[PDB]
Amino acid sequence: XXXXXGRXXXXXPXXXXTXXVTXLXXXXXRXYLRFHXXXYXXXXXXX
Amino acid sequence: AQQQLNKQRQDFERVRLRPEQLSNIIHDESDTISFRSNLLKNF
């Protein structure tokens, strides 16, 4: 019906500023250290 | 055997750093100062 010259345009529904736009194509119209290895009792203990 | 050195250090320091108490700790003045008696005397 609406198809024009081999083009299948059929599958279409047919029934501030106020600009006007064209329809169908819109455009303007833990762990804490332990004592060892912490450097005491490694220089100490006079007993 | 680094744990044995640590146990020895603990035994030594528990004796060295132990605080005296209710004994020869005897205090000077400015410690045994009664504020109440001075206030009464001045009154």
From Swiss-Prot, chain B:
It comes from the Eukaryota. It is found in: Nucleus. Involved in transcriptional activation. Component of the SWI/SNF complex, an ATP-dependent chromatin remodeling complex, which is required for the positive and negative regulation of gene expression of a large number of genes. It changes chromatin structure by altering DNA-histone contacts within a nucleosome, leading eventually to a change in nucleosome position, thus facilitating or repressing binding of gene-specific transcription factors. Component of the SWI/SNF global transcription activator complex. The 1.14 MDa SWI/SNF complex is composed of 11 different subunits: one copy each of SWI1, SNF2/SWI2, SNF5, SNF12/SWP73, ARP7/SWP61, ARP9/SWP59; two copies each of SWI3, SNF6, SNF11, SWP82; and three copies of TAF14/SWP29. Present with 2900 molecules/cell in log phase SD medium. This is Transcription regulatory protein SNF6. The chain holds residues 69 to 111 of 332 of the full protein.
